[PDB]
Amino acid sequence: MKLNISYPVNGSQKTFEIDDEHRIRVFFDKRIGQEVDGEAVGDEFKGYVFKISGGNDKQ
Amino acid sequence: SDAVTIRTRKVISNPLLARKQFVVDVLHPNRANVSKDELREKLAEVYKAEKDAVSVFGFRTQFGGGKSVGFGLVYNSVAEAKKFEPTYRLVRYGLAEKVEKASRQQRKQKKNRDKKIFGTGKRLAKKVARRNAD
Amino acid sequence: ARGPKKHLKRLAAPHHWLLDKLSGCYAPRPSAGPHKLRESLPLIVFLRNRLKYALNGREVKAILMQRHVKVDGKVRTDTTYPAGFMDVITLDATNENFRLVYDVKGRFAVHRITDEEASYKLGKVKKVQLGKKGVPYVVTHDGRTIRYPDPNIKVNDTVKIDLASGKITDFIKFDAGKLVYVTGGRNLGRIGTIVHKERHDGGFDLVHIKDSLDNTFVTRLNNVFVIGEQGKPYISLPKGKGIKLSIAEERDRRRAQQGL
RNA sequence: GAAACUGCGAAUGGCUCAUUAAAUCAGUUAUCGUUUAUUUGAUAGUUCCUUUACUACAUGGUAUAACUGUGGUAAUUCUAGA
RNA sequence: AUUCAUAAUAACUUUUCGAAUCGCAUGGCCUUGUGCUGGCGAUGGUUCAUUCAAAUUUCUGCCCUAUCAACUUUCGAUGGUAGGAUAGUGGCCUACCAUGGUUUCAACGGGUAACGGGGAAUAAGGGUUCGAUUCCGGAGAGGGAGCCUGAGAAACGGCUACCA
Ligand SMILES: [Mg+2]
Ligand SMILES: [Mg+2]
Ligand SMILES: [Mg+2]
Ligand SMILES: [Mg+2]
Ligand SMILES: [Mg+2]
Ligand SMILES: [Mg+2]
Ligand SMILES: [Mg+2]
Ligand SMILES: [Mg+2]
Ligand SMILES: [Mg+2]
Ligand SMILES: [Mg+2]
Ligand SMILES: [Mg+2]
Ligand SMILES: [Mg+2]
Ligand SMILES: [Mg+2]
Ligand SMILES: [Mg+2]
Ligand SMILES: [Mg+2]
Ligand SMILES: [Mg+2]
Ligand SMILES: [Mg+2]
Ligand SMILES: [Mg+2]
Ligand SMILES: [Mg+2]
Ligand SMILES: [Mg+2]
Ligand SMILES: [Mg+2]
Ligand SMILES: [Mg+2]
Ligand SMILES: [Mg+2]
């Protein structure tokens, strides 16, 4: 599923794709606003904290 | 071509529209009605204003021949006709081009097509361009 | 039916305008203003249908928007502005002044007046109340509000209004024997001094009127508009002087003036 | 001067006669029984504060469209995060 | 015709309005501060009046029908009191209380291939028949109900639900 990530300090954005049910899984049952650590989702993101802000489903 | 004779009845000095307005009574024996251009040119040559400031119209020739009766205008300037004249009239004369446009229902449709877009459009050009990958 | 009505089908338009049945469909609906719909003469009508100064309605906006026309003093730019009885219409260009007063047929006549008379107007006072803070006001038939009138000004009296400034400069009481102009009913347009008032508590006072032909009629007090003293109007009257000739008398006047 | 915000309008018009028989409608009344955009005419010296160490009036606050940019859906005048 | 217009007293208010707005012009004034003044008219603004309205409302007037004679209070029918609600009167709604209201001078019920009116047709007169339909009024937007916006809609080229 696509992650649409923003770095509001810089004004940047780029998307990232993930084909890993286990990595993906970390975001499950979390809500908008809840914070999420990085290393789980990818080693790229080791450290990085993400705030979940929204998104679309299929349809 | 036969004496003609152009009369002008019921005349009125009309200062709040910068012109003198009147009826035109054209006798024309042995002449199958006169014409608007001949009448602008002659009424110009009498009201001391010049052709392109005279306006003529209405006009229907009398039953059985002989006479036609119209209506005439004559502005104080060529700048005052060009501003107080209906724009289809200046067209008839040759002192304003017929700016042609699309159909009336071509235009309406464009208005409506345009209603389905919010904002600029080009923002929607690029985003629809990505579909061309999926 | 849901809200304010904005159109007027010609045919429903008031007759004293004299619009032709055909050529269109709607008549101009008078704007909200100083005179009731049904007793008004919109600028469109005056500039084109009476003065013949405009041929189009589109040309009437052309004339107006140059502020050529100005009502009761002020400039005014509203194709269908509700001009009304006693108002004063002015064209600076063409050096022309006008008053709206009635025919004998109950129509608004083209009546030319002097620059001098264009100074002022006449207003029937329609109510006199005590305003907020104890300031007394009068209110005239054309809906002007005027603060601090003379105490002896009561309802139905007529009033000479400055125009240039809003103030009052005179008032004629409603007494037996005072020049009157009739503003409604059949007797609309007639003129005649006043004989006597039928009181009638709680429902329409009748005003018996006689003119300068020793002819007599009657209207509701609502329809009666004082304008001075017998002999002495306070404004110039139209030719006719509001005397009403029989259909016979009118026939003869028109066929006595026959030889070109 | 596009776009967008703001304001106003979309309660007029046009169409039809299904319902409706004291209803509607007509003529005639009433508001000392109320609402009223607008037009027109009037209409406002007072706003702070235990009232000498004083209050932005030379004019106080952000949050948003359009926009830039990242996106979602087969699909609409759908719209999300930044 | 009023407890009216208007004003005065004691207070009350999640305190309404009392211009932080825009355009053309740029001039006067002396203690020379970029001081102090100041032209035309836009948009706005509270209250009142006016105008365009609206909403209710008085009196009288409707086609056929008794093989419709009694009708009205189930769960307001008719009135009184107080309140609530409304823009506001009012059983409009709710409490309490009472027993009223309409009818052979045809109530109540049924029918209408019934929207009303201005009008139309037919020509001795009296009448008879018609009016979906150019103007006025009313109602509706497939059927019902609900409501947002707003000065104004119970709006449908508005939304919401149910039914088709
Ligand atoms: Mg077009
Ligand atoms: Mg657009
Ligand atoms: Mg109008
Ligand atoms: Mg009365
Ligand atoms: Mg309509
Ligand atoms: Mg905020
Ligand atoms: Mg009081
Ligand atoms: Mg200066
Ligand atoms: Mg039966
Ligand atoms: Mg019996
Ligand atoms: Mg009661
Ligand atoms: Mg009970
Ligand atoms: Mg009982
Ligand atoms: Mg019977
Ligand atoms: Mg029917
Ligand atoms: Mg009909
Ligand atoms: Mg009928
Ligand atoms: Mg039918
Ligand atoms: Mg409706
Ligand atoms: Mg249908
Ligand atoms: Mg139903
Ligand atoms: Mg609806
Ligand atoms: Mg509609």
Contact (Cβ atoms closer than 8 angstroms) between residue C37 and residue C56: no
Sign of CA dihedral A31, A33, A39, A42: positive
Cβ partners under 8 Å of residue A4, min gap 6? A13, A15, A55
Q: Choose among B61, B59, B55: nearest CA to B41.
A: B55
Asked whether residue C51 falls in the same domain as residue C109, the answer is: yes
CA terminus-to-terminus distance, chain C: 57
Asked whether residue C28 falls in the same domain as residue C91, the answer is: yes
Beta-carbon count within 10 A of C37 CB:
15
Residue type present at position C141: H
Cβ partners under 8 Å of residue C246, min gap 6? none
Sign of CA dihedral A29, A33, A39, A44: positive
Provide the H-helix boundaries in chain C: 43-44, 58-64, 247-256
C38: which 2 tokens? 């049904």
In whole angstroms, how far apart are CA A33 and each of A11, A30, B79, B119? 19, 9, 69, 30
Which bases on strand E have an atom closer than 7 Å to a protein beta carbon? 1, 5-7, 47-55, 134-139, 151-156
In whole angstroms, how far apart are CA C25 and each of C5, C7, C117, C250? 16, 11, 38, 33
Burial of C35 (0-12, 13-18, 19+ CB in 10 A): buried
3-class DSSP assignment, residue B83: helix
In whole angstroms, how far apart are CA B128 and each of A15, A50, B119, B131, B134? 18, 29, 15, 5, 10
Contact (Cβ atoms closer than 8 angstroms) between residue C227 and residue C158: yes
Instruction: Give the C-alpha separation, C85 to C242, whole Å.
Output: 15
Q: Choose among C132, C133, C125: nearest CA to C150.
A: C125
Q: Choose among C189, C223, C229: nearest CA to C208.
A: C223
The answer as to whether C251 is a domain residue is no
Cβ partners under 8 Å of residue A5, min gap 6? A13, A14, A15, A16, A50
C203 C-beta less than 7 Å away from strand E: no
Asked whether residue C126 falls in the same domain as residue C206, the answer is: no
Asked whether residue C209 falls in the same domain as residue C238, the answer is: yes
C110 reaches B (C-beta below 8 A): no
Instruction: Give the C-alpha separation, B83 to C97, whole Å.
Output: 26
Give the β-pairing of A2-7 and A12-17: antiparallel
The range of the structural domain enclosing residue C158 comes to 121-171
Q: String of b and e for B60-88 (b: at least 16 CB within 10 Å)?
A: ebeeeeebbbbebbbbbeeeebeebbeee
C35 C-beta less than 7 Å away from strand E: yes
CB-based contact C68 B84, cutoff 8 Å? no
Domain count, chain C: 3
The answer as to whether C257 is a domain residue is no
- How was it solved? X-ray
Instruction: Give the C-alpha separation, C225 to C138, whole Å.
Output: 16
Provide the H-helix boundaries in C102-204: none
Spell out which residues of chain B touch residue C52, defining contact as CB-CB under 8 Å.
Answer: 12
Nearest C-alpha in C relative to B21: C53
Q: Choose among B69, B75, B61, B77: nearest CA to B21.
A: B75
Asked whether residue C30 falls in the same domain as residue C89, the answer is: yes
Asked whether residue C128 falls in the same domain as residue C185, the answer is: no
Beta-carbon count within 10 A of C256 CB:
8
Question: Is residue C216 left, alpha or beta, with left meaning phi > 0 and alpha meaning psi from -120 to 50?
Answer: beta
Nearest-by-Cβ selection for C68 from B12, B16, B84: B16
Asked whether residue C9 falls in the same domain as residue C104, the answer is: yes
Q: Which of C43, C61, C63 to mutate to test the interface with B (most CBs of B within 10 A)?
A: C63
The answer as to whether C91 is a domain residue is yes
Domain count, chain B: 1
The answer as to whether C78 is a domain residue is yes
The answer as to whether C253 is a domain residue is no
Asked whether residue C178 falls in the same domain as residue C164, the answer is: no
Instruction: Give the C-alpha separation, C70 to C64, whole Å.
Output: 9
The answer as to whether C164 is a domain residue is yes
C190 - beta bridge partners?
none
Contact (Cβ atoms closer than 8 angstroms) between residue C72 and residue C97: no
Cβ partners under 8 Å of residue A33, min gap 6? A51, A52, A53
The range of the structural domain enclosing residue B93 comes to 1-134
Asked whether residue C10 falls in the same domain as residue C112, the answer is: yes
Question: Nearest 5°: CA angle at C123, between C121 and C124?
Answer: 155
Contact (Cβ atoms closer than 8 angstroms) between residue B107 and residue B97: no
User: How many helices and strands (H and E) does chain C possess?
Assistant: 3, 17
Asked whether residue C50 falls in the same domain as residue C5, the answer is: yes
Task: Output the distance from A6 CA to D61 C1' rounded to whole Å.
Answer: 29
Instruction: Give the C-alpha separation, A3 to C121, whole Å.
Output: 80
The answer as to whether C255 is a domain residue is no
Asked whether residue C186 falls in the same domain as residue C233, the answer is: yes
Asked whether residue C51 falls in the same domain as residue C112, the answer is: yes
The answer as to whether C23 is a domain residue is yes
3-class DSSP assignment, residue C17: helix
